Amino acid sequence: NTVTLRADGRLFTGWTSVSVTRSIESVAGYFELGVNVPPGTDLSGLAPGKKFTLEIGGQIVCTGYIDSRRRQMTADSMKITVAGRDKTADLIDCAAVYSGGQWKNRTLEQIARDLCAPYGVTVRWELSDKESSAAFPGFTLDHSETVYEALVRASRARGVLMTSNAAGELVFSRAASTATDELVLGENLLTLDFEEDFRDRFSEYTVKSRKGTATDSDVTRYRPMIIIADSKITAKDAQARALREQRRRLAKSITFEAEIDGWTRKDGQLWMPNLLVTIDASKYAIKTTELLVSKVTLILNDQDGLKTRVSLAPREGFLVPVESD
Amino acid sequence: NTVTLRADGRLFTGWTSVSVTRSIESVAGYFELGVNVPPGTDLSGLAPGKKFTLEIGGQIVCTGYIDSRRRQMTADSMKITVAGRDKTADLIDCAAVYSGGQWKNRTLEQIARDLCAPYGVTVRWELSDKESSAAFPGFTLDHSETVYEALVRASRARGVLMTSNAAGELVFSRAASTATDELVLGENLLTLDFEEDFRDRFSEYTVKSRKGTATDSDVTRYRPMIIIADSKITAKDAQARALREQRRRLAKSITFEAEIDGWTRKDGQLWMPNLLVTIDASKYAIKTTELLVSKVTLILNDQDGLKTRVSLAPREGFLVPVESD
Amino acid sequence: NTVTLRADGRLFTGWTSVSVTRSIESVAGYFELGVNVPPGTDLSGLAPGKKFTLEIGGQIVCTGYIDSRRRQMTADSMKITVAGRDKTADLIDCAAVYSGGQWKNRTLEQIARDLCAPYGVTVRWELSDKESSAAFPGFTLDHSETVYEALVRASRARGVLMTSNAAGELVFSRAASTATDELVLGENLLTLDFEEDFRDRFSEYTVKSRKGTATDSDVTRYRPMIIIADSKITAKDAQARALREQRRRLAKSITFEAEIDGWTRKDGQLWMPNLLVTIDASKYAIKTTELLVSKVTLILNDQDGLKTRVSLAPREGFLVPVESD
Numbered sequence: 001n002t003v004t005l006r007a008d009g010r011l012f013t014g015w016t017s018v019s020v021t022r023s024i025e026s027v028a029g030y031f032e033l034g035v036n037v038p039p040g041t042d043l044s045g046l047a048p049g050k051k052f053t054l055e056i057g058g059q060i061v062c063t064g065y066i067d068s069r070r071r072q073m074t075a076d077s078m079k080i081t082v083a084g085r086d087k088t089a090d091l092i093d094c095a096a097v098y099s100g101g102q103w104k105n106r107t108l109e110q111i112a113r114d115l116c117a118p119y120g121v122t123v124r125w126e127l128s129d130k131e132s133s134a135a136f137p138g139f140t141l142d143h144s145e146t147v148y149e150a151l152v153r154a155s156r157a158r159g160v161l162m163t164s165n166a167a168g169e170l171v172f173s174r175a176a177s178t179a180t181d182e183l184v185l186g187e188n189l190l191t192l193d194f195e196e197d198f199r200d201r202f203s204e205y206t207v208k209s210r211k212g213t214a215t216d217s218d219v220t221r222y223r224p225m226i227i228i229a230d231s232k233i234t235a236k237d238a239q240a241r242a243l244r245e246q247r248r249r250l251a252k253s254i255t256f257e258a259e260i261d262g263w264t265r266k267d268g269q270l271w272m273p274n275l276l277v278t279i280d281a282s283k284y285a286i287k288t289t290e291l292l293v294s295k296v297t298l299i300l301n302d303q304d305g306l307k308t309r310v311s312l313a314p315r316e317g318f319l320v321p322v323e324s325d
Numbered sequence: 326n327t328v329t330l331r332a333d334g335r336l337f338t339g340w341t342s343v344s345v346t347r348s349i350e351s352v353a354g355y356f357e358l359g360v361n362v363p364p365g366t367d368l369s370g371l372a373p374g375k376k377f378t379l380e381i382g383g384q385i386v387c388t389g390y391i392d393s394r395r396r397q398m399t400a401d402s403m404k405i406t407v408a409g410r411d412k413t414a415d416l417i418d419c420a421a422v423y424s425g426g427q428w429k430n431r432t433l434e435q436i437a438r439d440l441c442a443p444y445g446v447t448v449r450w451e452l453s454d455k456e457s458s459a460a461f462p463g464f465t466l467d468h469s470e471t472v473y474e475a476l477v478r479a480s481r482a483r484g485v486l487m488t489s490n491a492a493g494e495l496v497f498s499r500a501a502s503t504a505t506d507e508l509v510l511g512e513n514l515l516t517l518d519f520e521e522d523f524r525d526r527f528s529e530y531t532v533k534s535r536k537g538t539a540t541d542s543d544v545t546r547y548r549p550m551i552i553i554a555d556s557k558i559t560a561k562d563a564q565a566r567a568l569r570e571q572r573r574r575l576a577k578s579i580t581f582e583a584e585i586d587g588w589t590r591k592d593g594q595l596w597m598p599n600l601l602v603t604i605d606a607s608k609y610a611i612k613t614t615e616l617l618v619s620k621v622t623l624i625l626n627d628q629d630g631l632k633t634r635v636s637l638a639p640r641e642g643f644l645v646p647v648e649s650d
Numbered sequence: 651n652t653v654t655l656r657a658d659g660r661l662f663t664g665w666t667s668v669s670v671t672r673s674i675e676s677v678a679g680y681f682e683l684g685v686n687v688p689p690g691t692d693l694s695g696l697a698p699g700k701k702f703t704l705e706i707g708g709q710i711v712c713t714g715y716i717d718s719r720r721r722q723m724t725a726d727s728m729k730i731t732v733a734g735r736d737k738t739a740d741l742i743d744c745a746a747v748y749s750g751g752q753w754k755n756r757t758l759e760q761i762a763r764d765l766c767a768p769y770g771v772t773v774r775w776e777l778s779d780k781e782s783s784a785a786f787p788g789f790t791l792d793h794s795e796t797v798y799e800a801l802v803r804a805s806r807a808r809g810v811l812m813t814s815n816a817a818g819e820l821v822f823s824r825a826a827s828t829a830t831d832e833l834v835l836g837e838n839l840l841t842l843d844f845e846e847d848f849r850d851r852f853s854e855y856t857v858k859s860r861k862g863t864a865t866d867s868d869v870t871r872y873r874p875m876i877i878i879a880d881s882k883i884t885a886k887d888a889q890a891r892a893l894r895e896q897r898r899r900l901a902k903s904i905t906f907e908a909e910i911d912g913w914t915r916k917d918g919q920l921w922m923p924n925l926l927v928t929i930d931a932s933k934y935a936i937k938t939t940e941l942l943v944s945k946v947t948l949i950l951n952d953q954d955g956l957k958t959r960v961s962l963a964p965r966e967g968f969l970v971p972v973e974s975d
Contacts, residue, residue: 039608048523049545065546068522071609075511078609094527095551118547144551186725197718198698202744220699221715222768226745226794283689284721284728364933373848374870390871393847396934400836403934419852420876443872469876 001057001263003300005033005082007066008045016302017081020054020061023295023311024175024273024318027092027148027164029062032083039078043069046082054084054166056263061270061298063168064089087168090119091147102140108132108151108158109172111139115147116170124171131322132158132172156244159322163274175292175318176276181265183258183310185281188266190307191259192281201249205242212238214246240321251317256291260308263298271296271308276315290315326382326588328625330358330407332391333370341627342406345379345386348620348636349500349598349643352417352473352489354387357408364403368394371407379409379491381588386595386623388493389414412493415444416472427465433457433476433483434497436464440472441495449496456647457483457497481569484647488599500617500643501601506590508583508635510606513591515632516584517606526574530567537563539571565646576642581616585633588623596621596633601640615640651707651913653950655683655732657716658695666952667731670704670711673945673961674825674923674968677742677798677814679712682733689728693719696732704734704816706913711920711948713818714739737818740769741797752790758782758801758808759822761789765797766820774821781972782808782822806894809972813924825942825968826926831915833908833960835931838916840957841909842931851899855892862888864896890971901967906941910958913948921946921958926965940965 005012017034031054037043046069054062063086070081096115103111109125116123127133136157141150155162155172163171183189203219206212208229227245229238256279263270273296279288291312298308330337342359356379362368371394379387388411395406421440428436434450441448452458461482466475480487480497488496508514528544531537533554552570554563581604588595598621604613616637623633655662667684681704687693696719704712713736720731746765753761759775766773777783786807791800805812805822813821833839853869856862858879877895879888906929913920923946929938941962948958 040610042610048521049543067524068520070521071519071611072516073510073519073606073609073611074516075608090546090548093524093548093550095549097549120546144553185723191722191724194721194723195718196698196720199717199743218699221740221770223740223743224745224747225743228794281723283725284723285690285692286721286723365935367935373846374868392849393845395846396844396936397841398835398844398931398934398936399841400933415871415873418849418873418875420874422874445871469878 003033004055005046006053006055007050008047010045012046015300018298018300020298021295022062022164022273024161024163024292025294027162027170028064028086028089029164029166030083030085031062032081034079034081036077036079043071043080046080052084056270056298059270060166062086062166086164087119087121088164088170091116091121091151091170094119094146096141096145096147096150098141102138103136104138105135106139107135108154108160111136111154112151112170112172115150119147122169124165124169126171126173127160132160134158153325156320156323157325159320161274161318161320173274174320175315176274177315179276179278179290180267181275181277183260183277183279185279185283185286188260188262189258189279189281190261192279192286193257194281194286195255195257197253197255201253202246205245207238207241207245208233210235210238212236212240212242214239214242216246216250218250234324236322237324240323243321244323247317247319247321251294251313254314254317256288256310256312258310258312260310262306263308271298271310277312279312292318294318328358329380330371331378331380332375333372335370337371340625343623343625345623346620347387347489347598349486349488349617350619352487352495353389353411353414354489354491355408355410356387357406359404359406361402361404368396368405371405377409381595381623384595385491387411387491411489412444412446413489413495416441416446416476416495419444419471421466421470421472421475423466427463428461429463430460431464432460433479433485436461436479437476437495437497440475444472447494449490449494451496451498452485457485459483478650481645481648482650484645486599486643486645498599499645500640501599502640504601504603504615505592506600506602508585508602508604510604510608510611513585513587514583514604514606515586517604517611518582519606519611520580520582522578522580526578527571530570532563532566532570533558535560535563537561537565537567539564539567541571541575543575559649561647562649565648568646569648572642572644572646576619576638579639579642581613581635581637583635583637585635587631588633596623596635602637604637617643619643653683654705655696656703656705657700658697660695662696665950668948668950670948671945672712672814672923674811674813674942675944677812677820678714678736678739679814679816680733680735681712682731684729684731686727686729693721693730696730702734706920706948709920710816712736712816736814737769737771738814738820741766741771741801741820744769744796746791746795746797746800748791752788753786754788755785756789757785758804758810761786761804762801762820762822765800769797772819774815774819776821776823777810782810784808803975806970806973807975809970811924811968811970823924824970825965826924827965829926829928829940830917831925831927833910833927833929835929835933835936838910838912839908839929839931840911842929842936843907844931844936845905845907847903847905851903852896855895857888857891857895858883860885860888862886862890862892864889864892866896866900868900884974886972887974890973893971894973897967897969897971901944901963904964904967906938906960906962908960908962910960912956913958921948921960927962929962942968944968 015033020031022029050066066084068083072079112123202225203223204215207227275293292315295311340358345356347354375391391409393408397404437448527550528548529540532552600618617640620636665683670681672679700716716734718733722729762773852875853873854865857877925943942965945961
């Protein structure tokens, strides 16, 4: 639909270039808009630091602060490029700070609340299982680490994913488990780039003399990878690390890059990551099972048209094994 | 004007490709010339290692040694590319060596003299204040560090910049403080690319439990960055490091990339870095204060013409805070 | 001639894109084939993990496992790209594993046998001198290092090169010493790119207080490089390391990139690395001595034709100095 940027209380529309990205791998979506402006156009509202809201046809798709403003000019004209990120960008950028220094008997959601507080970021817990909500006997910050880094460690200790959403909140969840969309070649799926790469896949991963391992049945030949770990590591944290490794490789090994027509799914909602979907390219013998959308890039160009780039990988690659500490 | 390369005592002119760069960030300017040569052309003088002098319309703009020679040929023709750097390149490349191993009650200028001596590089002290010239009770080299690295540490201990000039001398100074040129869009300024990027800017920088901090008023929201430092660090060396960090980010955050017509300034001199200037792009509401030229690239191409690329950033980004050791 | 890929027992031909690379620097040649396929084409045999044999006009040029399969499709057509490497790729990828953990009085060839065994890779010893075959009083693996890394250390301890060949075997040898081919500009040599770069060349290299050095007569001015090494290092392992450094720089400093017509040498054999050759570009005053082929890339494209890319550097750059441990 129509792209609108709400900044400095003002409203900006008419962008000739648009690119909005959001992925699981990150705790912050990114956006970038472009357009040529006639001399004498006030751009005071698109200044870095300005609070913004990025809307499309109405529904908000990103809220945070403007990161950058670029003006390229000649005697004749000027091209402006504005870029920003979800409020959660501060968590990725800045140090973890907590009046105390640690927590006692506090859950992940609770520790996140505290870390997020000074950044004015709200935490969104979308889990309803006992394991993930279990409290941490104790949790301590690690010298100057970012909020994001501290939370990766705690979230990893609870086997949950951390992401962000429009509105700019920190969301805790797990890879979608129910398929809700279908990509069909020739219809909503304009182009599909399916890549199966085993260069970094191993038959068995062994961490460190304590030890633990994870195997990968898809790798037909003997291909071991050894990971050196701390001497004092549970047979559990070993098996977990090993497994994390196997899944990370799976994720990067089996991938689909799809070009969708338009920006919305069948149900009208805008494409977003963490959606389980299926692909049908039968014409080329390709019909897939459950693929998780790891990333989405909504673009608008003159030589690209209104398209969405969707990256997908096996759901299993995004399950977070439980690792202590 | 006309580009001439004086090498092996000979004189070479007629280059079809020319690119000469000099920036504050470095202690050595770089150059590269190109041209197609008819079979049977002696290029023995453009051999790597050959001492050279690069002149433009007369005035020398770079002197050092040829670093490389490239010949690309077909049955029909050959394209030659020669590249070199100021004599000071050796200081960036090679180990710091000193018959003794340390100095006692010696100034920065004096320590530089010694380190530069074996490389046949002359030191140019362009400072006349007591602080910068203060002698070092003691100064010691650090296992295999380069001349450049040793001098960065000592120059940092005196809050001064280190650069090179035509003639290839090591120059000590501070960011220019007097504006002497004006870039006007449509006139001498053909194109301007103004970039304001706050992705790496923080509201406060804190180094390390000793501590010290520096804030950045331009960053409206709470965005802290913690820098872990040695336990035994002065409240001074802490505040200094913190401040260095703030300025380095400023430098990379607010930048202008300008395309100037020709190679000379209004007063006839060739463009060079460390010049305080002002920019006027009023047509697009842009009129700036004092910007320091951090880099200059003089180019000559068939599809570029005779132009100069000038990179500018706030002067304050280039002031060197005093840090001990 | 004709490019055929034997995979899954099947035979695939008609590739529109072909690129096969092999270089000394590596223990595994790489290949990649491309072609557009009509809907309904079975590609089950080109699946990652599949054992393959890459033949050209008959003679095999690479044998190993398929690493990747890529399918790019639109409603209209699909482009397939398959890539693989010599069997030896596993040695570069995987951990060194040995039922014991060490060897006693075993030669390089023997240690390689053992390390290679679980990967089903056969060792090819092409040396007949006493030094290289001398047994190691003792040799021990180093926590999780790859087979390739363990063997680099042992092969370095014997001054020999390690490479791979078609058939996918691990070969031990030394840089070819007899010239067997001549590249002549205008004839078999279509284009030549000769680069002489001294930016990373030093007059003297000194390792670490034990010490040892190597000089480089080609560097006319004083340019020292110091390499910090372990305190307990022989005056021998010092001189050796220093020399390795000098040769590595030589290799990257004086280089020729040549475009050969076709894929075969004069004697009919396909171009391969580790061939001593001479170049004659007299038309441009260039007639070289003995250059070693460090790499070869056999390509077939629509806008490139049937060509071979040959990279060459001074033979001396590839002699492996003896370093203990």
